[PDB]
Structure formats: C-alpha cells, structure tokens
Amino acid sequence: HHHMVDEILKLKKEKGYIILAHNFQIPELQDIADFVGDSLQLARKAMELSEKKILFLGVDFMAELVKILNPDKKVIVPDRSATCPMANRLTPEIIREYREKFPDAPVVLYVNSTSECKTLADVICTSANAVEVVKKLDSSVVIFGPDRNLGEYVAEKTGKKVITIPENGHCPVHQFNAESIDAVRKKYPDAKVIVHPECPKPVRDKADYVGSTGQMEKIPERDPSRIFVIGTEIGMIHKLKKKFPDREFVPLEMAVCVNMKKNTLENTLHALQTESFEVILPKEVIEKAKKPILRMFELMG
Numbered sequence: 001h002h003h004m005v006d007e008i009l010k011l012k013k014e015k016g017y018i019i020l021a022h023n024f025q026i027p028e029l030q031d032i033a034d035f036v037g038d039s040l041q042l043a044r045k046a047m048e049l050s051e052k053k054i055l056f057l058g059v060d061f062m063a064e065l066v067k068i069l070n071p072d073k074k075v076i077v078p079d080r081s082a083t084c085p086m087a088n089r090l091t092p093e094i095i096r097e098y099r100e101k102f103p104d105a106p107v108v109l110y111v112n113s114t115s116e117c118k119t120l121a122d123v124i125c126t127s128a129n130a131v132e133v134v135k136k137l138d139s140s141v142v143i144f145g146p147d148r149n150l151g152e153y154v155a156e157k158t159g160k161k162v163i164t165i166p167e168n169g170h171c172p173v174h175q176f177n178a179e180s181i182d183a184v185r186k187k188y189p190d191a192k193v194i195v196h197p198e199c200p201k202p203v204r205d206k207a208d209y210v211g212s213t214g215q216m217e218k219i220p221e222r223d224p225s226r227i228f229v230i231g232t233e234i235g236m237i238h239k240l241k242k243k244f245p246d247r248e249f250v251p252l253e254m255a256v257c258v259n260m261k262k263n264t265l266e267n268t269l270h271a272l273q274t275e276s277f278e279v280i281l282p283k284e285v286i287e288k289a290k291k292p293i294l295r296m297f298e299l300m301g
C-alpha cells in the first residue's frame with residue numbers, strides 16, 4: 001500500500017479499534033497509536049476504555065497482560081512471534097525448584113515474564129515499582145526473575161536478600177558498555193545520563209539517574225537540563241523528543257530490541273484488514289496470573 005498510515009487510521013475507526021503501542025515501537029507506529037506507554041500503563045489504559053477491540057503493538061507478554069486485565073476485550077497483534085527472549089529463559093520448572101529450596105521466600109516476577117510463569121508467582125513487579133514492592137513484602141528474602149540486573153538493583157536499594165532466577169537472566173538490549181558513559185561525559189559535560197535498572201552495575205553506578213521508561217519520561221518534568229543521554233531501547237528517544245521538543249535526547253548507544261521491531265506499518269495494516277492475530281489465553285491462565293497482579297496493586301495502593 002502507498003498510503004499505509006491513512007488506511008490504518010481509516011480501518012481502526014471503521015472497525016472500532018483502539019491502538020496501544022509500547023515505548024519501544026518504531027516511530028511510525030508510535031505516531032499512529034491512540035496511546036503510547038509502558039506495559040502496565042497500557043494495561044491500565046485498556047481497563048478505562050469503552051471500546052472492546054484493541055490492536056496491541058509490542059511483544060507477547062505485554063499483549064497478554066492487557067488480555068489478562070481485559071478478558072472480555074478482543075486483543076489482536078500484527079506479529080504473533082514478537083516475544084521477549086529474556087522472559088522465555090525462565091520456566092515453571094525453575095520456579096518450582098527454587099520455591100522448594102526457599103519456601104519462605106515470596107516469588108517476585110518482573111512483568112517481563114511469560115503468562116505461564118505469572119500463574120506461579122506470588123507478586124508481579126515493574127522496573128518502576130520493584131524496590132517498593134520488595135520493601136513492602138514481610139520477608140527479608142525474595143525469589144526474583146527473570147532479570148538478574150534488576151534483581152541486584154532491588155537488593156542494593158532494599159538491603160534484602162534477592163535470589164535471582166534463572167542463571168545469567170538478562171536483557172541483551174540493556175548491556176551497554178560503561179566506556180560509553182565515559183565518552184559522553186567528555187562530549188557533553190552538562191548532559192544528564194539516565195539508564196535503565198536492567199543495565200549492568202558499572203553502567204548504573206556511572207549514571208545521574210536510574211529508572212524505568214515511565215520514570216525516564218518524568219525526569220525532564222523536574223530536571224531543566226538541556227541534554228539527556230538515554231540508556232534504554234532506541235524507541236524511547238522518539239517518545240522523549242515528542243514529549244520534550246525543547247530538549248536534546250542522545251542514545252547512550254544504538255540498542256534495538258529485534259522483537260519490538262517485528263511490528264511494521266505493513267503487518268499493522270494486515271492486522272486491521274483481517275482482525276488477526278487474536279491473543280487467546282485459557283480462562284484458568286487468566287484467573288491464576290491475575291492473583292499476583294492484584295497482589296502488586298494491593299501493595300502499591
């Protein structure tokens with residue numbers, strides 16, 4: 001199609017779709033979305049909608065999070081293979097193993113986890129609320145996955161013991177070189193460096209701020225600095241530049257989530273033409289995964 005944007009806007013209105021896009025989507029998809037945000041922002045937005053049809057642009061665990069909290073809505077995705085390789089390395093078998101060895105340690109699962117894994121969790125957390133969630137739990141020991149870096153960050157801030165699963169659990173996208181910060185400090189002496197808690201400890205410790213994408217987009221609301229250096233996936237640069245056109249946003253390095261970039265204008269148009277591919281979870285998976293999500297809301301309420 002020669003005008004994919006205009007046909008997408010035409011079909012979404014005609015067929016009663018709200019388009020939700022994650023911060024890491026390509027700019028062209030962010031720009032056609034009704035809302036752009038982090039996984040829990042989009043799931044909460046979906047809960048407020050009068051509309052019953054959602055075109056979700058992200059990866060499977062996020063689309064499923066929307067479906068779990070919006071079970072009667074039709075949720076479609078343009079690429080059914082779009083997934084989180086980090087989430088996928090944690091298994092039910094590994095959770096059961098660690099529960100057995102540490103039975104008094106609550107299982108805290110990062111939202112970047114499979115819906116099957118969520119059915120086995122005591123509580124879910126986001127990168128924004130993980131410290132507060134783990135601080136508020138009774139236990140001085142927790143089981144945490146699937147990101148070892150976020151787990152270690154949480155242990156640093158809370159002073160609690162955090163038992164990370166799986167072994168070497170990590171996001172390839174956030175493995176920046178610490179030397180990249182050394183290089184921007186010299187190139188932009190007055191720039192503020194913001195990096196994700198999924199970054200390795202040497203990167204986190206050299207940044208001015210550590211936070212989630214949702215936290216990153218609030219830092220220019222209180223920090224009047226002209227230049228920010230951003231240590232997360234490249235999609236956030238577009239999001240920040242749109243929100244704060246008066247500031248400069250510099251990627252710490254080019255970091256692309258290949259799965260996030262599986263969604264294109266062409267397969268997004270195909271999704272609205274065919275109203276596929278529907279996100280379907282067994283009723284029992286929705287019911288079980290909902291328990292640790294409600295527990296998270298209870299702790300943050």
Ligand SMILES: O=C(O)C1=CC(=S)C=C[C@H]1C(=O)O
Nearest residue numbers: 038039040126127212213214
């Ligand atoms: O939506 C989310 O919560 C995220 C998702 C992913 S895939 C990476 C980072 C974040 C984050 O917001 O920091």
Ligand code: SF4
Nearest residue numbers: 084086112171173257
């Ligand atoms: S950026 Fe990292 S945590 Fe997020 S979907 Fe991609 S591989 Fe998973």
Ligand SMILES: [Cl-]
Nearest residue numbers: 070071072073
């Ligand atoms: Cl619903």
